[PDB]
Design a protein around this ligand. Structure first.
Ligand code: NDP
Ligand code: TOP
Length: 165
């Protein structure tokens, strides 16, 4: 029904870990820069827990926080309380990025068209995971080696998938 492209933006390890104790288990500033470059201009949709672990809105974008809390407000961020209310807020957007966490990924899982998954070649201790997906009708269209250096001490790859339907 909706008219915007729904895209997932995720970074996960070898066992699909995405978080430990409300934190990225890894420090990869270059990966975060890729996320900034890829999502520039477009709304960011994130769960309340994902937002609070991030701490502040991030400029040049509509930041949309998903919560059941009817009285939740954050300076310079928009609040939505359901998938449909996000779809409302984003009705004239060309593309929106679902940036986590796990519960918010589950929430939009039936709607995802495009998949930006950074795969990190390491097995981290973690408590939150990227959900399993039926990859039937999905095609990998892009893969590139991420920057490994002193500041970014792991091997990782940018993968993109498009749903064929
Ligand atoms: N590497 C990666 O790709 C990323 C990692 N992460 C990590 O994952 C963790 C966050 O994921 P997780 O803990 O699952 O939390 P979420 O980010 O999914 O936030 C959960 C919150 O979303 C709100 N919510 C959930 N379902 C609904 C619903 N159906 N309707 C309305 N609101 C809803 C609730 O907010 P409320 O309680 O206020 O009502 C809930 O507490 C963090 O540790 C973070 O570091 C997150 C994103 C990306
Ligand atoms: C917008 O940048 C951030 C993004 C994330 C989550 C995240 C990080 N990387 C990828 N590829 N996808 C995601 N959903 C987490 C962050 O910190 C906890 C960020 O800022 C510091």
């Amino acid at each position: 029904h909706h008219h915007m492209r729904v895209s997932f933006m995720v970074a996960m390890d070898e066992n699909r870990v995405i978080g430990k104790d409300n934190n990225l288990p890894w420090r990869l500033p270059s990966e975060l820069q890729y996320v900034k470059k890829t999502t520039m201009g477009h709304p960011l949709i994130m769960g309340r827990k994902n937002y609070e672990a991030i701490g502040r809105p991030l400029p040049g974008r509509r930041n949309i926080i998903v919560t059941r809390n009817e009285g939740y407000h954050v300076e310079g961020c928009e609040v939505a309380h359901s998938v449909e209310e996000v779809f409302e807020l984003c009705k004239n957007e060309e593309e929106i990025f679902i940036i986590g966490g796990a519960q918010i990924y589950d929430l939009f899982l039936p709607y995802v068209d495009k998949l930006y998954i950074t795969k990190i070649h390491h097995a981290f201790e973690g408590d939150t995971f990227f959900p399993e997906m039926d990859m039937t009708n999905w095609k990998e269209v892009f893969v590139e080696k991420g920057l490994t250096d002193e500041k970014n001490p792991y091997t990782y790859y940018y993968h993109v998938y498009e749903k064929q339907q």
